[PDB]
Amino acid sequence: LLNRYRALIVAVLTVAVFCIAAYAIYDLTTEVRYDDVVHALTTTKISSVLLALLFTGLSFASLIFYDQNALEYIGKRLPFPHVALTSFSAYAVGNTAGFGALSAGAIRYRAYTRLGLSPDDITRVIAFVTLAFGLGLASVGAMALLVIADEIGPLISVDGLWLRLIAIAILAALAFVVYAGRNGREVRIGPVAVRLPDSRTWSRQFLVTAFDIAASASVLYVLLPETSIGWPGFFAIYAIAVGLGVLSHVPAGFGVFETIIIAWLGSSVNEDAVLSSLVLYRVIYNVIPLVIAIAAISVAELRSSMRRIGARLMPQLLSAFALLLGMMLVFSSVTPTPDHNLIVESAHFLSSLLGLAIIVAARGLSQRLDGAWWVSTFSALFALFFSLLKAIAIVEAGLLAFFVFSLVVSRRLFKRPASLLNQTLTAGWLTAIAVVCIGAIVVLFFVYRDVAPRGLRAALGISIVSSAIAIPVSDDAVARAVEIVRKQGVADANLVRMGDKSIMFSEKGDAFIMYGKQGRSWIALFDPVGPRQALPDLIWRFVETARAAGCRSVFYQISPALLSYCADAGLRAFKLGELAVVNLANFELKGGKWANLRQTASRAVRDGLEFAVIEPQDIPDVLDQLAHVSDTWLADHNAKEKSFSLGAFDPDYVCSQPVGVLKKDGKIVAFANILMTETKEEGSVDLMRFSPDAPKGSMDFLFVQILEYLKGEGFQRFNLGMAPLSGMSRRESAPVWDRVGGTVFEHGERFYNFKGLRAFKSKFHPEWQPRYLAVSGGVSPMIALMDATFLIG
Amino acid sequence: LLNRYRALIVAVLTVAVFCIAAYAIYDLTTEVRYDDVVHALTTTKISSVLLALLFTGLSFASLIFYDQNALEYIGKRLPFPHVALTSFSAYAVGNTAGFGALSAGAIRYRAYTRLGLSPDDITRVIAFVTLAFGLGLASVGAMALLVIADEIGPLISVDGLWLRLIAIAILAALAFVVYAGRNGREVRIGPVAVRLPDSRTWSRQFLVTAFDIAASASVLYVLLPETSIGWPGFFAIYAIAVGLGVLSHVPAGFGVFETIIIAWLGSSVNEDAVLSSLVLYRVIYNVIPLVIAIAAISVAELRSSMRRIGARLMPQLLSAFALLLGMMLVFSSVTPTPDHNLIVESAHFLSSLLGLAIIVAARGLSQRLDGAWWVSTFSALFALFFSLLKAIAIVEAGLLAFFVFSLVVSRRLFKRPASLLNQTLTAGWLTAIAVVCIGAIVVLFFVYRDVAPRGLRAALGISIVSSAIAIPVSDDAVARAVEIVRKQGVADANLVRMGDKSIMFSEKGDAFIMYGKQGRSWIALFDPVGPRQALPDLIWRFVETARAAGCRSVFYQISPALLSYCADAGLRAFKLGELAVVNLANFELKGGKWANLRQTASRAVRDGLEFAVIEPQDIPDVLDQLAHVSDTWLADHNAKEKSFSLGAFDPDYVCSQPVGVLKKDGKIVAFANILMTETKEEGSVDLMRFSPDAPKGSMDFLFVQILEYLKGEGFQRFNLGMAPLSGMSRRESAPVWDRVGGTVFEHGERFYNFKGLRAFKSKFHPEWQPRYLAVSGGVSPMIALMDATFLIG
Ligand SMILES: CCCCCCCCCCCCCCCC(=O)OC[C@H](COP(=O)(O)OC[C@@H](O)COC(=O)[C@@H](N)CCCCN)OC(=O)CCCCCCCCCCCCCCC
Ligand SMILES: CCCCCCCCCCCCCCCC(=O)OC[C@H](COP(=O)(O)OC[C@@H](O)COC(=O)[C@@H](N)CCCCN)OC(=O)CCCCCCCCCCCCCCC
Ligand SMILES: CCCCCCCCCCCCCCCCCC(=O)O[C@@H](COC(=O)CCCCCCCCCCCCCCC)COP(=O)(O)OC[C@H](O)CO
Ligand SMILES: CCCCCCCCCCCCCCCCCC(=O)O[C@@H](COC(=O)CCCCCCCCCCCCCCC)COP(=O)(O)OC[C@H](O)CO
């Protein structure tokens, strides 16, 4: 149920469920000694750990076929070594993090926009993949719970009829969903409206997801020493444990997975064995895949060669690996050894400080900063020679030295400067910090219960991290922005002079992005305007400025050519609508398929309707007639005015650009703003105007003459309007859409008919051009679209 | 591995495996009392039997989706209530019988040729279905054997490594088969050459076959009272028990299924419970589906309405139901009750006699006789009022009275007369009789072991059944057959006068079929010749005459219009090749796409090559030149002559039909036989003749003039040659073909180039016409095609 959590109480409720889960871990693990857990790790039958490596390998092979199946569903057949990597390194993170910037979403985006998909199709790949895992895990858990409510029924002393009956309830619900969605037929089960694929496709997907959950239950089943349950009893436990640990949005499914397995198997087998198998499960299944995903980038970077997809995936992988590294550092700083460096109960507080600093550096590394690289490299080095002095500890030292190795290797990857601390907060990284802190508190209360200042110090360090986490332009800038609009390309940005939109610049001075702030996030207007080389340097700087004041950097109507370095900044693009573009050198007045426009023009030829080519100083002759016709087209919509879209009643902006008129053979009845550039390379309009002198036979010639004059000056093409998205592309959607995409199309049919319908643009036979809205920080474009909307109105 | 058993040692080896299995049943059931088994049937918790009915219902719902999936694979989308019936009544028989006339094969044929498929596609439906069940049962048993070699490992005291290792062996073999057959690529694993379908199709098929085997293991698992194993342990037992009971070709998988489950679960649970669950399994899963399949025909016959498919399926269903009825009669005659009608150890021998008589009547009813109806109806009535007098016995009396009800209902279904006993033997019905006899011997040795004349009497009755199972035409007939060729239609049958082919007739006198005998089977030549109404009456009479001398009634080159009542007789059609037909009223000498023939004719115009229109009495001028040119075209192939195909060196047959010649401008160098009828409705040729005066430029005009003269007399069309089957239709094949179809195509490219290649026929631009060979008795067309072949040569 992605893009439905619209809150910060989701961030609070996630760590609430983790607090309840960790309290239940400490409840269910009373009479176990930490020394006994260390004993059971040190004696664990190395054939069993090798077999756990084998089953993790089979699990990630099935995850590769999840995604290859997804790409065969939407027709986009991509080559296989560029899909094995982008879904062996999408589940190496998705099994670890579930945040905005670190999830399956913001890695499929960053690894497929570089690879060659369309952002209207990565939201099909992601959505089919997440329906695949969720619905397949529900079917698999409810079928393997159906066959055995007796091998696991009495283990929690719940009778076999009830545990089987809830599995029959889940299977009846999912059979109802499939039988509703037999042939198309989007079935609205609530907010989310599933539209299941072919029966030949969800069955292949069900095999792939059942082999995934089988070879990921068997990783833990080989590590549990000689249970009183078989394989499938443990498989029905595992498909409830994962089925709740991913249901509660916790990072990696940490606490809920742990507490379900401890609550289920402590009655069966010895609790030290289950803790020693769960810790050695989290290592083998959630850290070894990160290490292999890192090394298969770094080795190919040193030395067939997939350096582009490695360059787009390495910050995400390192930022998801540093978070588990920080969990390991804090959990191994709190658990004691006798010989400790009292460097001058407060001497291992340096190590916990380094661990929390490196997960803050992980939040930096996903944002791909430079201070993140310095802090993470040096903090890992300090942890290296302040943890190697104690013992050998090949897991700790080797894993952390691998982090240092990779992070020295990827220095040339990124040099982007910003302030590591001055970004305020996301909904997810607070959950990361708080899960590390609360898990550390539970490790401390767990360990020193059999045999403080360090506890109070770790809590005070976490509170200091929380406090540090808590821690229109001048007419010269507007005129210089107008000069940048002149001396460069796209003429869409002639909405620059109307004010109300803050304008930042670049260091080169010839590039700008135009703001606008509505809620907890400020948006943009068209696209960064300027030469090509100043745009990617500025597309990061915008988002850095947006996070610098604790806001999200939504975009609006961006180009498909922008995507290749738009998605690198952490921008989930979304399909919005297509912008009608008519090339002018490939145009004829009737041709074979333009004569409807010729007859509509000749409808106004007999009226003799005319035009104006007037100047930026030709205001004082027209202005009160402009006021009265403004009253008319405000009476057309019955008095509701919009910003961010058109030019309002403006004494300067209306007379700013050269405009053009519909006449009463000399008397102004309707006008039109025309928007050019100095470079003569592209021109546009924005507004059409109604009169009580123009019926449906003359909704065109006021604009047809403008098209002919823009042909007459010698422009290359012409950006007329922007249309909402058609019914055939409302057909091509994804399974787990919700009210989000419906209100994308409602925003389409709500704000894009103030100039004309899609068929009205189609009357001019245009070649369409898609425009997107990019959203920062992995948040819902329900929120982003409404932040655009309430800034329109 | 169908169409590879080519023997009677398969029939011997099947009952050998059943003898070993029944001896192992009697071995493993020493200390069990028959009274205790009756106790455990009478106390069996009626909720458990209702739940077994539910799981049988789910199993046959999945069997319906086996076949609906199969019909969606080959594109032929058929309506669903005509597929639910023809695969709820194809597995109601296939789970009971595995013979020639009673299997999935000879019910898919009889229920799809009526329904609307092509016999080149029912051999795709059948073959995809049998690969589906076999390969899916192997994958399912090897996967559910993989997860648990510990819940069922020590039950037979075999260590868990070996039972898991053979499952890894099976899964590695099947993964090798799939990875070989990724994209097309027919992988020859031996005699059988699997070519697996789409990954989107065998996965859906794997779900359907795993839900089948799950809901058929659970029918028996609900009947076993409180095992020491879970569900999936019993599922891994069941997928070995079925996986060997269908591997050994035994009817219903009787003895092998029984002995595997007794051998596996007698060590776990009490043996009386396993016998009481296996008998009540065979009832619920193999007799209740026959009863429902019968009643859903008979009720719809009395009263939406599918009377055609019921009329084609009811004899197969009744003949597979009477066999289990006979097993029940013999097994309930041997098992004793105290009060018995001593009508005057030999008074219940009447009941065993009635049971063996009714399974002989079942062999009659599949062949759809009339004495079969009389013997089966009256023998069931005698069993009714000589078994109802003993006790109530609602299962026995109700089941048998249902048989009497259905068989009175289907009197109007069939009235076909033949001798019920005088058919000699099939490979399968001897296995039916012998499995009933040996199972009866084991029931007798089982029951009277705790506490004979009846045993010796049952053995003598079976030996009497075995002994009773052990129990060119005149020139008037040839000339009358030539008169039937004259006064009626197809001119293919002008091979009638050459002798060597026995000619039977009909009772109406104006219809005939022409024999030819090679091995243990005699074949036919073209098609029954005559009016339409005398053909279906004769198409049964041919097969009755063939079984009357203990032989199989193969056909050769039959029409697609014959299939609708050809498949009713029990004739598995097979695609053979297409017969080139050129309509003459829709023909032009060059048109747009015939001018190659015009230029090839003008190649011989400058030679001035000519023809003959000579008579049946114009022999004595040409005959020695015919002898020398016969020496030439015997020197063409280098001296190897064929029967059954053309006219040989014949003093009567060569001069019989009007022939036509290639000349040395008057001197005979090459001839051609031309074949007409009196009705002027269709004409043909058979033989083209080589000369040492005709190169590749004149392989045509000798025949082109014949085509023009057959146009000139005024015929409708022209049966020139018969071509082998093309490469695109050697592409459209089925998965479990073997050397059979390969030698069908080898027979094609081996015997059909003595007149010309497929492109040689394509030079004349023909409209193709498929011709089939029908095979009786469910036997392989390897055998039938070679019986045609060694009668050609
Ligand atoms: C207590 C009562 C509550 C019940 C109410 C149920 C309502 C359900 C409504 C649906 C809301 C879903 C919201 C989640 C959205 C989200 O968060 O995003 C999408 C997610 C990520 O998918 P992602 O791509 O990120 O992959 C993640 C993989 O890595 C996981 O990782 C790990 O946890 C690893 N440790 C293990 C790896 C495993 C193999 N790789 O997918 C989803 O749809 C999640 C839906 C899951 C639904 C499960 C339903 C419950 C199952 C129980 C079965 C029946 C038995 C009942 C007995 C009680
Ligand atoms: C002891 C060592 C020997 C091993 C050697 C293996 C070689 C295999 C070579 C393959 C030859 C196949 C020859 C059969 C051909 C034939 O006869 O015809 C095709 C059949 C019918 O198909 P049909 O359409 O007729 O349906 C039938 C349904 O009704 C059955 O009925 C019943 O029995 C009911 N009582 C139950 C209904 C169940 C649900 N409905 O299908 C086939 O391919 C048969 C192939 C089966 C292959 C199984 C392999 C072994 C499985 C074991 C798994 C691994 C574990 C190993 C541990 C030891
Ligand atoms: C009700 C089920 C619902 C549907 C789910 C069905 C899914 C089945 C698919 C399972 C595939 C993976 C199988 C993993 C099973 C592990 C079995 C196992 O326990 O391993 C034992 C031994 O394993 C081996 O010897 C090697 C097994 C290798 C399995 C390789 C699988 C290949 C076949 C997979 C099928 C798919 C083929 C394509 C693969 C890409 C070790 O156990 P143990 O004796 O150590 O246990 C005692 C105690 O627990 C302490 O350990
Ligand atoms: C390792 C596995 C390999 C792959 C196989 C996986 C296939 C799983 C699919 C199974 C579907 C059918 C499930 C049948 C399980 C039967 C469970 C059972 O035992 O029934 C119990 C109770 O059953 C019920 O209460 C009702 C169960 C109804 C199940 C209906 C299945 C619907 C869901 C099927 C999934 C598909 C959905 C579409 C269906 C067309 C009765 O047991 P008991 O307590 O009597 O046992 C004690 C002793 O044995 C004596 O009996």
- The domain spanning residue B716 has which CATH number? 3.40.630.30
How many residues does this entry show for chain B? 793
Select from A281, A301, A323 the last residue of a domain. Answer: A281
The rounded Å distance from CA B359 to ligand 2 centre is 25
Note which residues in 132-161 of chain A have CB less than 8 A from chain B.
147-148, 150-151
CA nearest ligand 3 atom 10, residue: A214
Residues of A in contact with B201 (CB under 8 A): 200
- Residue of B200, B202, B234 best to disrupt the A interface, most CBs of A under 10 A: B200
Is the Cβ pair B230, A233 closer than 8 Å?
Answer: yes
Q: In this structure, what DSSP letter does residue A200 have?
A: H
Establish whether residue A146 lines the binding site of ligand 3, counting it when its CB lies within 6 angstroms of any ligand atom: no
A225 touching B, CB under 8 A? no
Which chain B residue shows the shortest CA-CA distance from A210?
B207
Pairing between β-strand A770-776 and β-strand A571-583 as defined by DSSP bridges: antiparallel
The dihedral region occupied by A577, where left means phi > 0, alpha psi between -120 and 50, and beta the remainder, is: left
Q: Which of A120, A33, A53 is nearest to A578 (CA)?
A: A120
The domain in which residue B767 lies consists of 580-781
Element (H, E) at A687: strand A683-688
Interrupted backbone of chain A, residues before each interruption (C–N > 2.5 Å): 303, 344, 451, 471
**Closest-lying ligand 3 atom to the alpha carbon of residue A62:** 40
3-state secondary structure B498-536: CCCCCEEECCCCCCEEECCECCCEECCCCCCECCCCCHH
Q: A403 exposed, middle or buried (CB, 10 Å; 0-12, 13-18, 19+)? A: buried
Element (H, E) at A675: strand A668-675
The one-letter amino acid code at A323 reads L
The resolution of the experimental structure, rounded to one decimal in Å, is 3.7
Gap between the Cα atoms of B655 and B674, Å rounded: 11
Establish whether residue A61 lines the binding site of ligand 3, counting it when its CB lies within 6 angstroms of any ligand atom: yes
Q: Tell me, yes or no, whether A332 and A438 share the same domain.
A: yes
Residues of A in contact with B204 (CB under 8 A): 199-200, 203-204
Q: Is residue A372, in this structure, part of any structural domain at all?
A: yes
Q: Is residue B466, in this structure, part of any structural domain at all?
A: no
Per-residue tokens: A187: 């079935």
Exposure string for B726-754, b = 16+ CB within 10 A, e = fewer: beeeeeebbbbbbbbbbbbbebbeebbee
For chain A, counts of helices (H) and of strands (E): 29, 12
The rounded Å distance from CA A473 to ligand 1 centre is 48
Cβ pair B482, B497 in contact under 8 A: yes
Exposure string for B223-233, b = 16+ CB within 10 A, e = fewer: bbbebebbbbb
Q: Tell me, yes or no, whether A187 and A277 share the same domain.
A: yes
Looking at CA atoms only, how far is residue B389 from chain A in angstroms? Answer: 44
CA nearest ligand 1 atom 48, residue: A243
Q: Which of A731, A720, A728, A733 is nearest to A768 (CA)?
A: A720
- Residue of A72, A207, A228, A229 best to disrupt the B interface, most CBs of B under 10 A: A207
**What spatial distance separates the first Cα and last Cα of chain B, rounded to whole Å?**
29
Tally the C-alpha atoms within 13 A of residue A496's C-alpha that lie toward its C-beta: 32
Q: Tell me, yes or no, whether B654 and B719 share the same domain.
A: yes
Is the Cβ pair A199, B203 closer than 8 Å?
Answer: no
Select from A225, A256, A281 the last residue of a domain. Answer: A281
β partners of residue A775: A572
Gap between the Cα atoms of B729 and B733, Å rounded: 7
Phi, psi of A580 (to 5 degrees): -75, 120
CA dihedral (A647, A648, A649, A650) in degrees, to 10, reads -50
Please, where are the H alpha helices in B287-306? 288-302
Per-residue tokens: B651: 């003093």
CA dihedral (A638, A640, A645, A648) in degrees, to 10, reads 90
β partners of residue A580: A720
Gap between the Cα atoms of B481 and B510, Å rounded: 8
Helix, strand, coil shares of chain A as percentages rounded to 5? Answer: 55, 10, 35
Please report, for residues A106, A506, A571, A774, the alpha-carbon distance to residue A535 in angstroms, rounded to integers and kept in the order given: 22, 9, 15, 15
Annotate A575-601 with DSSP letters as a single string.
Answer: EEEEEEEEESTT--SSTTTTHHHHHHH
A198 touching B, CB under 8 A? yes
Is the Cβ pair A232, B147 closer than 8 Å?
Answer: yes
The one-letter amino acid code at B401 reads A
Q: Which of A172, A169, A87, A88 is nearest to A128 (CA)?
A: A87
A206 touching B, CB under 8 A? yes
Q: Which of A754, A757, A760, A759 is nearest to A793 (CA)?
A: A754
Technique used = cryo-EM
Tell me which ligand sits closest to the C-alpha of residue B142.
Answer: 2
If one counts the domains in chain A, the total is 2
Gap between the Cα atoms of A194 and A202, Å rounded: 13
Helix B288-302 vs helix B46-73: crossing angle, to nearest 10: 70
β partners of residue A659: A673
Q: How many CB pairs under 8 A join A and B?
A: 48
Please, where are the H alpha helices in A74-121? 81-88, 91-94, 105-112
A199 touching B, CB under 8 A? yes
Q: Which of A199, A200, A230 sits opposite B148 (nearest CB)?
A: A230
Three-state DSSP class for residue A188: strand
CA nearest ligand 4 atom 39, residue: B58
Cβ pair B511, B538 in contact under 8 A: yes
Q: Is residue A591, in this structure, part of any structural domain at all?
A: no
Phi, psi of A326 (to 5 degrees): -70, -35
Distance of alpha carbon B557 from the chain centroid: 18
Q: Is residue A9, in this structure, part of any structural domain at all?
A: yes
Residues of B in contact with A150 (CB under 8 A): 230
Gap between the Cα atoms of B509 and B503, Å rounded: 12
Q: Is residue A566, in this structure, part of any structural domain at all?
A: no
Residues of A in contact with B214 (CB under 8 A): 147
Gap between the Cα atoms of A600 and A126, Å rounded: 47
Gap between the Cα atoms of A430 and A439, Å rounded: 14
B741 touching A, CB under 8 A? no
**CB under 8 Å to B222, separation ≥6 — which residues?**
B48, B51, B52, B55
Q: Tell me, yes or no, whether B529 and B650 share the same domain.
A: no
Q: Tell me, yes or no, whether A27 and A63 share the same domain.
A: no
**What spatial distance separates the first Cα and last Cα of chain A, rounded to whole Å?**
29
Residues of B in contact with A198 (CB under 8 A): 200
Q: Tell me, yes or no, whether A300 and A265 share the same domain.
A: no
Per-residue tokens: A204: 């292949």
Phi, psi of A683 (to 5 degrees): -140, 160
Gap between the Cα atoms of A106 and A83, Å rounded: 15
Establish whether residue B144 lines the binding site of ligand 4, counting it when its CB lies within 6 angstroms of any ligand atom: yes
Tokens 């039988």 belong to: A179
**CB under 8 Å to A518, separation ≥6 — which residues?**
A787, A788, A790, A791
Q: Which of B203, B206, B231 sits opposite A148 (nearest CB)?
A: B231
B210 touching A, CB under 8 A? no
Q: Strands, E, within B506-612: which ranges?
A: 512-514, 521-522, 552-553, 571-583
Helix, strand, coil shares of chain B as percentages rounded to 5? Answer: 55, 10, 35
Q: B463 exposed, middle or buried (CB, 10 Å; 0-12, 13-18, 19+)? A: exposed
Q: Is residue A683, in this structure, part of any structural domain at all?
A: no
Establish whether residue A136 lines the binding site of ligand 1, counting it when its CB lies within 6 angstroms of any ligand atom: no
Per-residue tokens: B122: 């029912």
Q: Which of B200, B214, B230 sits opposite A204 (nearest CB)?
A: B200
Per-residue tokens: B734: 């089925």
Q: Which of B533, B486, B482, B488 is nearest to B506 (CA)?
A: B533
Pairing between β-strand B521-522 and β-strand A512-514 as defined by DSSP bridges: unpaired
Exposure string for B758-793, b = 16+ CB within 10 A, e = fewer: bebbebbebebebbbbbbbbbbbbbbbbbbbbebbe
Q: In this structure, what DSSP letter does residue B227 have?
A: -
Q: Which of A225, A232, A217 is nearest to A56 (CA)?
A: A217
Q: Is residue B457, in this structure, part of any structural domain at all?
A: no
B531-535 LR contacts (CB < 8 Å, sep 24+): B531/B488, B534/B506, B534/B508, B534/B510, B535/B511, B535/B562, B535/B565
Residues of A in contact with B151 (CB under 8 A): 230
Tokens 């000694």 belong to: A33
Q: Tell me, yes or no, whether B543 and B655 share the same domain.
A: no
Q: Tell me, yes or no, whether A233 and A301 share the same domain.
A: no
Cβ pair B433, B359 in contact under 8 A: yes
CA nearest ligand 3 atom 12, residue: A215
Q: Which of A87, A110, A107 is nearest to A99 (CA)?
A: A107
Q: Is residue B417, in this structure, part of any structural domain at all?
A: no
Note which residues in 228-287 of chain B have CB less than 8 A from chain A.
230-233, 235
Cβ pair B662, B691 in contact under 8 A: yes
Q: B100 exposed, middle or buried (CB, 10 Å; 0-12, 13-18, 19+)? A: buried
Q: Tell me, yes or no, whether B150 and B232 share the same domain.
A: yes
Gap between the Cα atoms of B92 and B57, Å rounded: 12
Q: Tell me, yes or no, whether A257 and A149 share the same domain.
A: yes
- Residue of A231, A235, A238 best to disrupt the B interface, most CBs of B under 10 A: A231
B296 touching A, CB under 8 A? no
Is the Cβ pair B203, A200 closer than 8 Å?
Answer: yes
Q: Tell me, yes or no, whether A263 and A372 share the same domain.
A: no
Query: B163, B220, B240, B246: which to mutate for ligand 2, most atoms within 8 A of CB?
Result: B246
Gap between the Cα atoms of B175 and A496, Å rounded: 63
**CB under 8 Å to A3, separation ≥6 — which residues?**
A738, A740, A780, A781, A782
Cβ pair B117, B125 in contact under 8 A: yes
Looking at CA atoms only, how far is residue A310 from chain B in angstroms? Answer: 30
The rounded Å distance from CA B53 to ligand 4 centre is 13
Query: A222, A224, A270, A285: which to mutate for ligand 3, most atoms within 8 A of CB?
Result: A222
Phi, psi of A573 (to 5 degrees): -70, 160
Distance of alpha carbon A162 from the chain centroid: 39
Per-residue tokens: B57: 């219902």
Gap between the Cα atoms of B184 and B194, Å rounded: 10
Per-residue tokens: A427: 């909904």
Q: A36 exposed, middle or buried (CB, 10 Å; 0-12, 13-18, 19+)? A: middle
Three-state DSSP class for residue B575: strand
Helix A429-447 vs helix A453-470: crossing angle, to nearest 10: 170
Cβ pair B198, A200 in contact under 8 A: yes
Three-state DSSP class for residue B766: coil
Select from B286, B315, B336 the last residue of a domain. Answer: B286
β partners of residue A112: none
Per-residue tokens: B30: 């020493």
Helix A81-88 vs helix A46-73: crossing angle, to nearest 10: 120
Q: Tell me, yes or no, whether B612 and B683 share the same domain.
A: yes
